[PDB]
Every structure is written in C-alpha cells, then in structure tokens.
Write a protein that binds this ligand. Sequence first.
Ligand SMILES: OC[C@H]1O[C@@H](O)[C@H](O)[C@H](O)[C@@H]1O
Length: 292
Amino acid sequence: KKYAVVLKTLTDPFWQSMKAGIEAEAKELGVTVDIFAAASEGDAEAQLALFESLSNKNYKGIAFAPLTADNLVEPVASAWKKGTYLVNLDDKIDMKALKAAGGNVEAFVTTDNVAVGAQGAGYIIEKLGAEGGEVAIIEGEAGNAAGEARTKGATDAFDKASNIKLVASQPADWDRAKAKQVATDILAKHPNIKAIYCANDTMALGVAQAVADAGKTGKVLVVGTDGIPEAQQAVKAGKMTATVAQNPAAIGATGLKLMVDAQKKGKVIPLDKKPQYVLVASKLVTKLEHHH
Ligand SMILES: OC[C@H]1O[C@@H](O)[C@H](O)[C@H](O)[C@@H]1O
C-alpha cells in the first residue's frame, strides 16, 4: 500500500518544500506517497474532509500538518483505531484531546519553535544594541501551536532585554496582505518602532512592504521565519533583516521515514504510549557580511 500526506496548503513555498522533501525521501526509501492539501485555503473543515476521504483509501500511514490544533482530532483518532500509522508534522495537534478521542500518533516532527522565536527576537535585541527600542510581533493564527511557541519565545526574550519595549503583539493569520495591513497599523500607532518579529516569512514579506511603503526600509528591522526563497532574497537585498530558517524538507522526510519505520513493529503505537518527538534544526539567516 501507499502513504498519504495532508499538508496545510500546497500553494506556499514552505509547504511546497515539505512536499518535495517527502518525495525525495520516498525516492530513497522506495515507497509511494500521495501528498495533498484541501482546495479551500486555510479552511479547517475542508482539510478535515480531505483527511476523512483519504483515511478510507487504505493507506498504510498518513502524515498530517493540521490547520488548527483541534480540527483533525476526530479523524486522526478514527484512523488510529483503524490501524493507520500516523505522524504529526510541523504543527502540534491537541494531544490530550486526541487521547480523549481514543487515538494517538506514532510521532510528532517539528522545529523547536520556542527557540525560533527566541532566535528571531534575540537577533533583533543584538542588532538594536544597548539603546534597544520599541518592538512588535506579528503573530500567526491564534492558537496554532507552532506560531504560539514562536510568539512565546520572542516575547520572553524581549521581556528580559534591557531597553526593549514590546508595544504590539498581533495576529496576521499567516497572510501576507493581512501582515502588511497589521504592520501599517503598527507603524502608524508606533512611529518609533524599531523592529518587528514575524512568525513566518509570508507575513514578514508583507511587513517588509509596509515598512517600504512608510519609507522606513532599514530603519525598522523585519525578521521572519521559515527561510523561503523570497525571504532569503529579501535578506540578501536588505528588504528583510533576517529570517529563522526551518527545514521543511527534512520535517517532511523525517515524518515519512518515521511512518515507514513505525510499521516494522507490526502494530500502531499503543494508546497509552508517548509518541516519538523529533526536532529538526533551525538556522538564523542574516545578510552575509564579509566586509571588515
Ligand atoms: O502555514 C503557516 C506556517 O505554519 C507553521 O506552522 C509552519 O511551521 C510554517 O511557519 C508555515 O509557514
């Protein structure tokens, strides 16, 4: 049989890299993998419906990145009861809710997202120096576990830092236009803002455009997360200050490998057993300076 992967979306580069990484790993393992996302973008109910349709196609295993912590709880529990080998990718499902629903997953593969936020905020703190300044966080969608961890890690770092004042922490729901809108509002209400940490690059690129439109490119630091090509290009060009790169290809490849390796014991993970927890490294991408 084959394996299935349900991602948040296939239109955005972070997730496209994850799909490509899954396929590269499938090519090394010699397994067949179908990778999907639901047509309605960001629709948690559409993604549930997609998951439910796949869970009835006799896949050996399904890896999934849920759009929210709760939207896939019931169909994941249902698949576990059917003996499906399940791997949570990237964004943490509500595991206590999953257990209450009667299910489990073999593994969760993710980035240390508290560390991501701490790195993004930490680089801002380093770049602002002793004088510090007003900073803001553009959050992902409220309640998404990975985004929440980044907000926590950044907020904690900013709170401890001398002369840093976090003046705004606001969701833009992983959306570039909405992040441009939120950044425009922050720039209007906080004309002394010195830096904005953004929970992903889709948002950071919108923020960078708001900063440019305000004539403030280089005057307001903009840090993203994911490391998508356009953000790495923005960092090179000075349009973004940095981005905390993730490795979506490795997240996907590792999740597929865990799903394949899980079947060797001939049974899905017991209900009372803790899933595997596999961290994939992040890396701060800054403007490459070799000039003394
Ligand atoms: O889909 C929006 C975002 O979801 C997070 O959970 C992922 O780690 C990436 O940052 C992605 O860009």
